[PDB]
């Protein structure tokens, strides 16, 4: 700050730190489980 | 006098012995907090909570002047939260059927 | 125990019952509360007299 | 940043109904019929003039998804299909391509350990 | 529901703004809404008169 | 548990519940003693799987 | 040099005698030091640490009506989950000094069964008896372990006692079952446990966690019992215990017990504990 | 059981049943509320005439 | 059992000491309920528990009857299994999701629920409708959601997802939007956007319970806390930017 | 010891998915398991949990 | 079926909510579409009249 140095990175507190986890990274496309399921299991069978 | 008012009713207690339980006690270089108590900030928070004061609805809880903390505005007397919902309710709640803005657009 | 308020009533609320303390106090006994003149180190500064 | 700079300023209403000697017909939106053939062309017809995704295909989704997407986006308005078909480019929530990925490696490598 | 009820029987006019009023006619409760959302002011009651 | 505080009610559902007494159930090795979870689980409304 | 003077004050109807000299001092090299602490009375009967003693009748019709100090600090300590309180560590403390009162006794045992090679058979009544009676006097405080140890390898055994050993043993280590079942026999039939099991369960428990240990029977003499110099208590033998640059300023601002709060004189900005001041959206 | 259920038959005898629940849970109406110091200090939930 | 019973068949030996026996015996007493009891304590001493492990040893307690305490203080130790049982069961040895119930309008059909980002500037309150026509949809303060997020598409598809990951389609679901925070001009942006995205999210949960397990997952239903910072005049553009220094 | 104990995890999880015929409405796996745990999360499926990819 | 018709539960069998695909569809009840300059009326008008009440009232 004033006449001193910077800290460095990770002494800060988290920059997304009131993000919650299952937000960071989304887990989006749960539409395509199931999809996906089915058709592991037919191409098994095959 | 008009400080007549001002003496001590009782006799206030000596203080005739050492340090509590875990006091600060401060050697060489020690940060050192006569305000947190020693040995129950010392413990785990997973074990007794993120909670500071009872968990019970905030109405009972007063903001205090000049002290930073809480206090009951019944002193030291709890209800808990059961008691503040009509018997037995959902969630406890006014009614069982909504939310507060389920409520509201209901009723709009 | 310690003092968390104080209020200005009546003392005949609470005051010492009748078959405890002398007879009639009024008639028998002259008393006027009055201050110690001297300095006193402990106790109570007003004292019945 | 404006769409709008060479609009006309009118702001003001219109029915050919009164204000003309013409016989009306209304025109609506694309339904589903027309909007398919349309965005159908716009994309593949696209993409084979070389305008399009090309190597970068597996990028963006597939056309069902996209047709349903820009559907709910435009709401099958021609002006606004056409827009969106554009605007495709930058859509950052969709997860299709990702999760058809992790699968057909998922099946592949479950084909390497029946080899091996 | 099932309470035996005195409510006063409502008379339809078109000529009248707001709501005519008239004698008392026994009726049973057919559904009462305690919720304030379930019954807006002026609250209303659900009945059945008796006599038609 | 029965819900005390807020908190709690959100962590709180009869068809949850269902998984719980599911796992209680399988835990038995022999129908009487199943009998009885079965008759509470049906009492208390439960989600039946 | 343009000292301070500072003119004493004296005892007054709201001001008493202690009051003054423990709040007020008229020195001023001895101002801004720091804060001094105190106790009354049950912070001063934990802290003083007086055993009581025993006396007439109401003493012990308290020793009679006394019941289980073990299960009612884990009353105590549970009852924090009452909606009304909160879970204490010092409860906790409590809890944990009365489960392990006894603790280094059993430390002492697992000395005797496992820190001595060839301990006679220690079925046979002799040195049974030798190791009943050291143990309660390691318990009671009459003996230092280490006294009561090397008593214990010193106890006079069997005339000839090696050349009897080496018809036994090649390099003199006996088998150690006998010494952990009388180990756990003398904790039983003196009465050192209120539960039975307590005994037997420490004692094994704490042998099967120093099992994995490197070199894991053998001892530093100086470390092994009380002496002057100690281990940590992480590390003691068979015990029981085997933003960020703003942090410094921050202190009071998390989730925080106190003993003292905080006062307006003393801090500028902070709101107090319970404050939520990123308040997420629940149902 | 008010109605006898199908599956009467089938519970258990009471045998070995020395944990029995229904007395283990049952408290004398005694031990369910303490009087504290803040009950005798209770104010009145009615206006008093004269205190 | 069968242990037990050939232990005891067997009965004493020709071993020295006894040997095998008290081999049999102390490995016996590890299998006791005393012993795990004591197991359970030593585990506690050492704080391998977390609150709930206490609550649960609380309702455990409050369960005895004074008779019942008197009862079991006799073996001196199993008042110590009743209270401890279940962190005893789990030393010695998982609710997914919330799947509730519906909440709507029995009449309207209507379901409401509530988005909000910055505590303040954002929030918003969906009510979702389920149209039987497949013609459905997006409204916000009654204008239509297309001109109210400005056609910007990476906004729209915000709102989109939920119906995407509830595997439904949009065009069967009505809903329209309301704002109860800070009203401005145009709320197209996207935090606002974000903000929109959770309200009708928790809107169609309200509609249809099982949907809330997806939704959850793909971390919709999520409530992020993030503000600007506070007004301040000891910052030069008023947040974050601290006055120029000189040294002296 | 480390590839003693990889070869064993990556086996049995072939044996998870590989076991997957009948499993389709087979008994193999829970009904609730089939409610709760068949979705992409950061145990099962996971895009990926890490930045610069 | 309507999305309320659908049995999403693996394991139960409902019954179907008794609004299912009954209530009907017209934008005139619903979703709520509005002109703005009714809007603005509407808005200031209900600022406006918040001090005009009859309190006593036959």
Same mark, same amino acid.
């Given at each position: 700050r004033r006449g001193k140095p910077r800290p460095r990175?990770?002494?800060?507190?988290?920059?997304?730190?009131?993000?919650?986890?299952?937000?960071?990274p989304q887990q989006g496309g749960q539409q395509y489980f199931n999809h996906f399921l089915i058709r592991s299991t037919n191409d098994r069978l095959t | 006098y008009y400080w007549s008012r001002y003496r001590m009713p009782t006799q206030m207690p000596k203080f005739?012995?050492?340090?509590?339980?875990?006091?600060p006690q401060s050697m060489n270089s020690t940060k050192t907090n006569?305000?947190?108590?020693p040995i129950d900030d010392k413990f785990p928070m997973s074990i007794?909570?993120?909670?500071?004061?009872?968990?019970?609805?905030?109405?009972?809880?007063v903001d205090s002047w000049y002290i930073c903390t809480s206090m009951t505005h019944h002193m030291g007397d709890y209800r808990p939260?059961?008691?503040?919902?009509?018997?037995?309710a959902f969630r406890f709640r006014?009614?069982?059927?909504?939310d507060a803005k389920g409520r509201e657009y209901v009723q709009y | 125990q310690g003092a968390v308020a104080t209020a200005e009533i009546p003392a005949f609320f609470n005051e010492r019952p009748a078959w405890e303390r002398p007879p009639l106090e009024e008639t028998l006994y002259v008393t006027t509360n009055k201050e110690r003149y001297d300095d006193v180190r402990?106790?109570?500064i007003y004292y019945d007299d | 940043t404006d769409r709008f700079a060479n609009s006309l300023d009118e702001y003001a209403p219109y029915d050919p109904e009164k204000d003309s000697h013409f016989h009306p017909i209304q025109i609506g939106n694309f339904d589903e019929y027309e909007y398919r053939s349309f965005l159908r062309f716009l994309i593949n017809s696209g993409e084979l003039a070389?305008?399009?995704?090309?190597?970068?295909?597996?990028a963006s989704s597939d056309f069902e998804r996209k047709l349903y997407k820009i559907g709910f986006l435009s709401g099958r308005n021609p002006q606004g299909v056409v827009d969106h078909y554009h605007q495709?480019?930058?859509?950052?929530?969709?997860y299709q391509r990702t999760r058809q990925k992790q699968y057909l490696l998922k099946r592949r490598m479950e084909g390497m350990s029946r080899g091996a | 529901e099932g309470l035996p009820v005195r409510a006063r029987r409502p008379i339809f006019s078109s000529s009248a703004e707001q709501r005519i009023a008239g004698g008392p006619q026994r009726a049973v409760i057919i559904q009462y809404h305690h919720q304030p959302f379930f019954n807006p002011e002026p609250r209303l009651v659900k009945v059945a008169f008796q006599c038609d | 548990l029965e819900p005390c505080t807020p908190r709690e009610w959100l962590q709180f559902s009869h068809r949850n519940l269902a998984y719980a007494y599911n796992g209680a159930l399988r835990a038995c090795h022999s129908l009487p003693s199943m009998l009885l979870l079965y008759k509470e689980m049906k009492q208390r409304g439960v989600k039946v799987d | 040099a343009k000292r301070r003077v500072i003119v004493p004050i004296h005892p007054t109807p709201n001001f008493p005698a202690h009051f003054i000299k423990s709040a007020f001092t008229?020195?001023?090299?001895?101002?801004?030091?720091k804060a001094r602490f105190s106790s009354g009375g049950e912070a001063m009967r934990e802290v003083q640490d007086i055993p009581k003693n025993l006396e007439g009748e109401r003493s012990r019709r308290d020793l009679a009506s006394r019941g289980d100090t073990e299960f009612q600090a884990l009353v105590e300590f549970i009852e &924090?989950?009452?909606?009304?309180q909160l879970i204490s560590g010092r409860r906790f403390k409590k809890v944990y000094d009365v489960l392990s009162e006894n603790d280094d006794m059993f430390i002492w045992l697992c000395h005797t069964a496992m820190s001595?090679?060839?301990? &006679?058979?220690?079925?046979?009544?002799l040195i049974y008896n030798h190791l009943r009676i050291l143990a309660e006097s390691v318990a009671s405080g009459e003996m230092t372990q280490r006294t009561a140890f090397r008593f214990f390898e010193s106890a006079v055994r069997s005339p000839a006692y090696r050349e009897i050993a080496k018809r036994q043993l090649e390099g003199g280590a006996a088998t150690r079952l006998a010494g952990i079942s009388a180990a756990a026999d003398v904790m039983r039939r003196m009465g050192?446990?209120?539960?039975?099991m307590s005994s037997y369960f420490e004692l094994y428990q704490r042998i099967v966690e120093r099992?994995?240990?490197?070199?894991?029977?053998?001892?530093?003499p100086l470390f092994?019992?009380?002496?002057r110099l100690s281990l940590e208590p992480r590390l003691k033998?068979?015990?029981?215990?085997?933003?960020?640059?703003m942090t410094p300023h921050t202190?009071?601002? &998390?989730?925080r017990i106190f003993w003292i709060p905080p006062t307006w004189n003393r801090a500028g900005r902070f709101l107090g504990?319970?404050?939520?001041?990123?308040p997420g959206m629940t149902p | 059981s008010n109605t006898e259920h199908?599956?009467?038959?089938?519970?258990?005898?009471?045998?070995?049943?020395?944990?029995?629940d229904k007395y283990r849970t049952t408290k004398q109406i005694?031990?369910?509320?303490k009087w504290t110091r803040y009950d005798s200090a209770r104010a009145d939930n009615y206006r008093p005439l004269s205190i | 059992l069968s242990r037990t019973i050939t232990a005891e068949a067997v009965?004493?030996?020709?071993a020295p000491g006894h040997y095998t026996n008290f081999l049999e015996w102390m490995g016996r007493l590890t299998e006791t309920r005393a012993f795990k009891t004591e197991h359970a304590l030593f585990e506690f001493s050492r704080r391998k528990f977390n609150r709930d492990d206490v609550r649960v040893m609380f309702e455990n307690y409050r369960l005895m009857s004074k008779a019942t305490l008197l009862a079991d203080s006799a073996d001196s130790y199993s008042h110590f299994y009743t209270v401890l049982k279940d962190f005893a069961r789990k030393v010695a040895g998982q609710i997914g999701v919330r799947i509730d119930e519906a909440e709507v309008d029995?009449?309207?059909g209507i379901a409401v629920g509530r988005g909000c980002a910055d505590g303040e500037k954002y929030h918003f309150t969906a009510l979702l409708r389920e149209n039987r026509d497949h013609n459905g949809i997006i409204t916000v303060m009654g204008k239509p959601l297309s001109l109210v997020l400005d056609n910007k598409a990476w906004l729209m598809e915000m709102v989109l997802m939920p119906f995407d990951e509830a595997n439904l389609?949009?065009?069967?679901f009505d809903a329209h939007i309301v704002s109860?925070?800070?009203?401005?001009?145009?709320?197209?942006?996207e935090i606002a956007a974000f903000a929109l995205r959770m309200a009708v999210a928790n809107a169609l949960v309200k509609l249809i319970?099982?949907?809330?397990i997806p939704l959850k997952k793909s971390g919709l239903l999520s409530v992020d806390r993030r503000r600007e910072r506070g007004q301040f005049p000891g910052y030069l553009d008023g947040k974050k930017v601290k006055r120029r220094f000189a040294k002296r | 010891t480390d590839r003693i104990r990889r070869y064993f995890r990556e086996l049995e999880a072939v044996h998870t998915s *590989?076991?997957?015929?009948?499993? *389709?409405? *087979?008994?193999?796996?829970t009904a609730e398991h089939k409610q709760q745990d068949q979705f992409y999360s950061p145990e099962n499926q996971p895009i990926s949990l890490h930045r610069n990819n | 079926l309507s999305p309320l018709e659908v049995?999403?539960?693996?394991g139960r069998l409902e019954p179907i909510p008794s609004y299912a695909g009954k209530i009907n569809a017209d934008r005139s009840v619903f979703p709520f579409q509005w002109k703005t300059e009714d809007w603005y009326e509407y808005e200031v008008a209900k600022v406006r009249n918040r001090r005009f009440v009859f309190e006593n009232t036959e």
């Open positions: 990175a990770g002494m800060f507190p988290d920059k997304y730190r009131r993000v919650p986890m299952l937000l960071k | 005739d012995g050492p340090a509590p339980v875990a006091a006569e305000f947190i108590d007794r909570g993120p909670l500071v004061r009872p968990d019970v609805p905030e109405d009972q809880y939260w059961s008691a503040s919902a009509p018997p037995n006014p009614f069982n059927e909504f | 402990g106790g109570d | 070389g305008l399009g995704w090309g190597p970068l295909w597996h495709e480019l930058v859509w950052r929530y969709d | - | - | 008229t020195d001023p090299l001895k101002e801004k030091q &924090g989950a009452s909606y009304d001595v090679l060839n301990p &006679g058979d220690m079925r046979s009544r050192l446990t209120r539960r039975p099992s994995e240990a490197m070199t894991p029977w053998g001892f530093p092994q019992f009380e002496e033998f068979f015990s029981r215990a085997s933003g960020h640059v202190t009071l601002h &998390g989730r504990p319970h404050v939520t001041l990123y | 199908f599956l009467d038959k089938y519970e258990p005898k009471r045998n070995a049943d020395t944990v029995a005694t031990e369910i509320d | 009965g004493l030996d020709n029995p009449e309207t389609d949009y065009r069967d109860e925070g800070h009203a401005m001009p145009s709320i197209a942006n319970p099982l949907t809330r | *590989g076991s997957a015929s009948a499993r *389709g409405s *087979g008994g193999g796996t | 049995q999403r539960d693996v």
